[PDB]
Design a protein around this nucleic acid. Structure first.
Lengths: 205, 86, 82, 80
RNA sequence: AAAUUGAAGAGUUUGAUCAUGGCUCAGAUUGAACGCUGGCGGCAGGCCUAACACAUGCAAGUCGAACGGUAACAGGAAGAAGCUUGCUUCUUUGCUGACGAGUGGCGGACGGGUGAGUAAUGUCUGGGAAACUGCCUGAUGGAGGGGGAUAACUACUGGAAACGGUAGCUAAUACCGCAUAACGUCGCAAGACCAAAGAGGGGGACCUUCGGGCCUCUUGCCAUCGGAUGUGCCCAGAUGGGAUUAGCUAGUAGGUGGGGUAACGGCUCACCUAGGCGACGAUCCCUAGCUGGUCUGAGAGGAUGACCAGCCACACUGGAACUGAGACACGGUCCAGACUCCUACGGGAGGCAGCAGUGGGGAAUAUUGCACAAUGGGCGCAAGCCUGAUGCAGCCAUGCCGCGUGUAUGAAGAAGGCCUUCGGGUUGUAAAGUACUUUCAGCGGGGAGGAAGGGAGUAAAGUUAAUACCUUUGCUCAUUGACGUUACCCGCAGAAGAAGCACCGGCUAACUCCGGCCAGCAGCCCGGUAAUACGGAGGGUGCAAGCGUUAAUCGGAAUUACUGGGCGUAAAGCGCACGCAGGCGGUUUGUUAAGUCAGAUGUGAAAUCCCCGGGCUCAACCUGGGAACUGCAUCUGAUACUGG
């Protein structure tokens, strides 16, 4: 129910950085990003339509660390909700608890953010929530527990996040080690190199 | 029977069967008397047998042996049959 | 006779009773005549767990319907709170 | 004011009874065509008032025999 | 406010093309099975086949406030003591707390199981009249006075047993008359007729024949008319296939009369009439429980009817009735049959398609568990007893959902493995090393909620002649949990206990090396000596506590085309015509309002589906409200079109 193997292999296969490493270096200094994994990585074959759709879906999944059953249920709920299916899907993906904890700055990677959440080190409205897929609603307050504020993991993650960009829908205080989920991000707030319509066409065929 | 209540119910049921059989045979005899008086064409004997039959029929209908509807049916049928003679 | 009782719906270890008017011979969760409320015994006191209509309950009691002991206690507490 | 039917008498050979055919216009549940459907009823006709072909008005009542549960109300058109 | 916002193609006939046409695939889904593998939890599901046969335990009892009672244990008791005189230990007493057996009342027709039969004696929808209805409930009345029995018991006695027989005794709210008798039954009427039962709590005095009568309250009893509920009955429409089944029917269709039922009715009988059903599929044959619903589909449809809920049928096979308000009765009765068992050989006993379980069949489906603590049920004034319903637990990855099997750093990129143009590349930050963390599992400590009640006390009110008893209402006290070591929380230790399956020629994401049309693969179109198709290795791809294969349904399949196809040559115009049933029908006026349309009412069970919220840490799941249930009937109108 988790991917534990090599991380940079996924970003090499997707041809794009998936932020699977903290950021102490550039990925170019740790692996051949422009080369696909394996013995036959130098070749690049012409992808089919199904190939491109599958590769975009896998890129999104590996970005958010979501397996196929949960992602299929996410698409089902997004197609159930009113509006455009793609932005609904991306909003449902961004609402996760481990995703927010990573974006909040308490995790260097979404894997260590998921470890922080699962290990009962993250609180939501004063209630310790240890579900990574926990849907965070607007106005929710996310904070590190008193016992886990002493970890150097959170400090390094805070620093690494300060060297990153700041999301518009997160009001975080690094001193109190707490943040607020103000609102769901609109389509224009997430990455622009993610084609949601490819996933919609892949799941609607 | 396997249950104690089933055995007691069988005993009570056969006792009540015998009691009800005696009562029903009495009522049937007293109605057959009226029917035979109807056959004979004797209107005085018919009314006598009807007057003897009515009380026990009402009583067995009241005691739960037969329904009030059955008693009313017997009374009405025999009355209409007696009125067809005199 | 006709009785007003609870039908234990809900999940395991989290019961949810529906106050139903039913002929007392049917099963608990079986055939009933009319549902006159509900009762959530594990309510968080933040929400409502006692929404049993007293109008139809009184109408049925006026017709000889019997009230079970739990429903009688529920009616007493609903009258006291309201 | 009483709920009733109307049909034509197709048989009167029996005594005190007639057979009335109630024709109805029903749409086919699949192909949408309006097809004719016939409902033949054993109707109680006391006085033997109805002949073959009369358009009669009938109503439902208690069972009067094994197959008769409808009775006659009046005759509208009389076999001509 | 929301609650139809919904529709994808590909491979394969040919040297090639277009068309036709079938086969196959990509999607969902399952009561699944098998193979490899397998950490935890929540919620659900779990004999689809042999309605095959069943060992064993339990699944329906309850009331002493109906009754005679006392056999058992607990007490009171009068009288006799071992005697270590305050332990008193046995002789007799229903005196009472209770209670075995027995009569009696209620319940065993509910609850639970299965889908054999049933193609309409059923189910669904919508109507109807000729009916009954225990317990619950409203109103009005009555509740008087007697008798004969009988179980238990006693004595004798027959049987291996099962179970009886005879004689005597006793009780009742058991049974039977009498009186009474109407807004009840019969009858137009006059009139005639029909019922009952007590028990319990307490008590001021008056009167007691020392049991108590007398007062009050509760409860029970009988009669009638209603309510509610349940059930019985009738009609219309709908509800599989076959014409290689076209005629069927004698109680058959109807009528009069008798009987019968709670009730209408050929329900039954006598007689009379000669009908009735059928091409709109009667009759016959095969299959089949029906529905809300479930799966699939854009929809229309197709398939289906496990769990949950309603209805029906069945209870070893066939038949039958008895009791009862209700049965022709799973754990009742009688008979017959098959089978199994006990036997003293004369006779007996039994029916898991109740809960576990066994043998068998099968590819395949679980424990001979805990508790009545909650809900419901039976009985009881109540306490309470019973409850394999039910609440839970055990087993199974069977499904859905959630979480974990670590995280960060980590190179000239170690070793080995594989490939190599022998330069190197890849496995690969992957590992090792370093720093950190401890969800879940393991050990220990705290700890909700499911719990309402019930009991004992007092106080108030009502009732009453009564400041008793009883009912209701406040408060006080001591308690009521199978789950259970609960959920949840806290502490400890250590990466420590936790990743596999399928695939890589195209469809279809994923490529190289090595070993001869053989071995083998294959869902549809490879292998005859450098095979991306066989087998192994490296690498990669997709899923992931699962992964594949098989079986099955729908989709794609517009491939049964109503929505939505065709027939010159691809499958398809009868050889031609006349013509009954049927289908359709020029044009105008009037009328009707059957089709059609509009509005309203009733109904369309709950659950499920969908929408907005709520509670479980999230989800699954549970749940509030709404929408929906596209249908049917009735009533009132419209008159353009179809019909008369």
């Amino acid at each position: 129910a988790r991917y534990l193997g090599p991380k940079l292999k996924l970003s090499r296969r997707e041809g794009t950085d998936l932020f699977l490493k903290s950021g102490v270096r550039a990925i170019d200094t740790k692996c051949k990003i422009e080369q696909a994994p394996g013995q036959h990585g130098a070749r690049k074959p012409r992808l089919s339509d199904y190939g491109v759709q599958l590769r975009e879906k896998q890129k999104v999944r590996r970005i958010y660390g979501v397996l196929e059953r949960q992602f299929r249920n996410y698409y089902k709920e997004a197609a159930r909700l009113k509006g455009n299916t793609g932005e609904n899907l991306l909003a449902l993906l961004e609402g996760r608890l481990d995703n927010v904890v990573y974006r909040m700055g308490f995790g260097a990677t979404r894997a260590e953010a998921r470890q922080l959440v699962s290990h009962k080190a993250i609180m939501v409205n004063g209630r310790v929530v240890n579900i990574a897929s926990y849907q965070v609603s607007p106005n929710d307050v996310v904070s590190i527990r008193e016992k886990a504020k002493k970890q150097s993991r959170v400090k390094a993650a805070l620093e690494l996040a300060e060297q990153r960009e700041k999301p518009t829908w997160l009001e975080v205080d690094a001193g109190k080690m707490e943040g607020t989920f103000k609102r769901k991000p609109e389509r224009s707030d997430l990455s622009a190199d993610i084609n949601e319509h490819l996933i919609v066409e892949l799941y609607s065929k | 029977a396997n249950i104690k209540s089933a055995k007691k119910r069988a005993i009570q049921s056969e006792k009540a069967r015998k009691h009800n059989a005696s009562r029903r045979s009495m009522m049937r005899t007293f109605i057959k008397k009226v029917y035979a008086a109807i056959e004979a064409g004797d209107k005085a004997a018919a009314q006598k047998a009807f007057n003897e039959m009515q009380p026990i029929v009402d009583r067995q209908a009241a005691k739960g042996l037969i329904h009030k509807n059955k008693a009313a049916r017997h009374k009405a049928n025999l009355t209409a049959q007696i009125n067809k003679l005199a | 006779m006709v009785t007003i009782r609870l039908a234990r719906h809900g999940a395991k270890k989290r019961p949810f009773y529906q106050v139903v008017v039913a002929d007392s011979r049917n099963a608990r969760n079986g055939r009933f005549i009319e549902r006159v409320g509900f009762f959530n015994p594990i309510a968080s006191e933040k929400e409502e767990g006692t929404r049993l209509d007293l109008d139809r309950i009184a109408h049925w009691v006026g017709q000889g319907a019997t009230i079970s002991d739990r429903v009688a206690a529920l009616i007493k507490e609903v009258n006291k709170a309201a | 004011k009483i709920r009733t039917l109307q049909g034509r008498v197709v048989s009167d050979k029996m005594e005190k009874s007639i057979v009335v055919a109630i024709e109805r216009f029903v749409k086919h549940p699949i192909y949408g065509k309006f097809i004719k459907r016939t409902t033949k009823l054993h109707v109680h006709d006391e006085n033997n008032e109805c002949g073959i072909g009369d358009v009669v008005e009938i109503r439902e009542c208690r069972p009067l025999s094994k197959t008769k549960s409808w009775t006659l109300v009046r005759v509208v058109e009389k076999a001509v």
